[PDB]
Design a protein around this ligand. Structure first.
Ligand code: HEM
Ligand code: G29
Length: 452
């Protein structure tokens, strides 16, 4: 069929398009190029050719097959934040990624997902008898920060369990993301002129140095053991594998960082959106509270319960569909293939625009937020909010729990209000790596007026 896209104006194309991404934001550039051209088209980030697809069929083909299990980005930028052949999130070494994913995959399922539902509860309760830490004089709560802390506290108690200063680590995790996001696709010229990224180089060191202190104490606590396999958290599983010879110490320290930042990074921003959604849809928030009484009463939340919270389940899915945080997935082709009649050479970067695809395909009322879109059991081949196949979200299951749980325990106890005219749509957003609130603008606060 040959590939839709802008002109390769003899080396001018690649410069305008890359340049567009840097000015626009990886997020919006895709939403732009999809709109103007096809729902499948070619652009250039650095030299390398790169597809951007919002066709459900292409999307599904990609995430399904094993020869797409790699992402992409500046080898200089990934090296700088420490994810260059080290993490899993952006680990592009297919063998070295292959042997690391199992560790995440194990810790984020089975007994840990059972532990989580209650670890999430107790770790949110603690912080809700502590609003003094987050609340304005005028009653305004700093929802974002609150969430990040309970998210990081949750991640700690499950995967690492070593005493730390939430307050301080959160600000650092932010700096790390800020940097990661800044450097993911900066062209190499950028890295020569060094006084131009020293900020980002210092935000990385901050978090890394703060965590090397944490893993150092975690190592002591295993070398003086109360009989080993009694308490096998993610962090240990790794350290024990290192002291076999499967992982580099360096490689371990990244997974433990990548395992910590993940939830605060994304769950906080996601739940925050769902909160401006519950606060502007009274019809919905009533359905949820009733469902919570029907199923739980004022008992504690337990694993057996989560399947029953069906209306909330549809709320999370509809909030993620209508107002996503992770709206695009970056993959890369490893073997050549034809996909939807188009040829795609190995080495071709891919950006799946799942955020646009959730408005162009399947759904009945795509452009309005309604629990109506999920009244008819969604095929999952038309709604991929986590991804799937050999490189889907590793947290994809645990997350669905944690949201359910922290949404329950919150709504269970507070009515939520949005300062003045504000709402998800009127909120000002940055559309770069993710799709998150612009934190330098204000009016992002909420008001937690009690209940019953
Ligand atoms: C609801 C919030 C979340 C959303 C929307 C989300 C979404 C995603 C998406 C779309 C991907 C890319 C998968 C693909 O390429 O198809 C991803 C990757 C990943 N996610 Fe999440 N995720 C969420 C929560 C979490 C949580 C709570 C964790 C663990 C703390 C987590 C851990 C990971 C990891 C480790 C990867 C990289 C997997 C790999 O490339 O090998 N995620 N996530
Ligand atoms: C604030 C905020 C936020 C959430 O988005 C980021 C970036 C995610 C990335 C997975 C791979 C993803 C989906 C990609 O392939 C491109 C963007 C990537 C994701 C979701 C995973 C963990 C994390 O800490 C941070 C993120």
């Amino acid at each position: 069929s040959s590939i839709p896209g802008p002109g390769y104006c003899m080396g001018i194309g690649p410069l305008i398009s890359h340049g567009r991404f840097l000015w626009m934001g990886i997020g919006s550039a895709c939403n732009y190029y999809n709109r103007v051209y096809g729902e499948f088209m070619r652009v250039w980030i650095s030299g390398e050719e790169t597809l951007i697809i919002s066709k459900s069929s292409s999307m599904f083909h990609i995430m399904k097959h094993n020869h797409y299990s790699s992402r992409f980005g500046s080898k200089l930028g990934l090296q700088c934040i420490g994810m260059h052949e080290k993490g899993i999130i952006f680990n592009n070494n297919p063998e070295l990624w292959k042997t690391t994913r199992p560790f995440f995959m194990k810790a984020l399922s089975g007994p840990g997902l059972v532990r989580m539902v209650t670890v999430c509860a107790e770790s949110l309760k603690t912080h809700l008898d502590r609003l003094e830490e987050v609340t304005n004089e005028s009653g305004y709560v700093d929802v974002l920060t609150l969430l990040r802390r309970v998210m990081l506290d949750t991640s700690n108690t499950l995967f690492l369990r070593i005493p730390l200063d939430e307050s301080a680590i959160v600000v650092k995790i932010q700096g790390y993301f800020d940097a990661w996001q800044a450097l993911l696709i900066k062209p190499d010229i950028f890295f020569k002129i060094s006084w131009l990224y020293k900020k980002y180089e210092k935000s990385v060191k901050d978090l890394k140095d703060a965590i090397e202190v944490l893993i150092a104490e975690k190592r002591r606590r295993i070398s003086t053991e109360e009989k080993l396999e009694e308490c096998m958290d993610f962090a240990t599983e790794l350290i024990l594998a290192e002291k076999r010879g499967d992982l580099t110490r360096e490689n371990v320290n990244q997974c433990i960082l990548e395992m910590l930042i993940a939830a605060p990074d994304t769950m906080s921003v996601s739940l925050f959106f769902m909160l401006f959604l519950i606060a502007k849809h009274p019809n919905v928030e009533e359905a949820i509270i009733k469902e919570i009484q029907t199923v739980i009463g004022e008992r504690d939340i337990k694993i057996d319960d989560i399947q029953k919270l069906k209306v909330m389940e549809n709320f999370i899915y509809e909030s993620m569909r209508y107002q996503p945080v992770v709206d695009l997935v970056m993959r890369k082709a490893l073997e050549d293939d034809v996909i939807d009649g188009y040829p795609v050479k190995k080495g071709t970067n891919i950006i799946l625009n799942i955020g646009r695809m959730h408005r162009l395909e399947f759904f009945p009322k795509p452009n309005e937020f309604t629990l109506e879109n999920f009244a008819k059991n969604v095929p999952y081949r038309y709604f991929q909010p986590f991804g799937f196949g050999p490189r889907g979200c590793a947290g994809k299951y645990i997350a669905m729990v944690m949201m359910k749980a922290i949404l329950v325990t919150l709504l269970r106890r507070f009515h939520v209000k949005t300062l003045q005219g504000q709402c998800v749509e009127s909120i000002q957003k940055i559309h770069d790596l993710s799709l998150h609130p612009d934190e330098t603008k204000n009016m992002l606060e909420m008001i937690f007026t009690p209940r019953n």
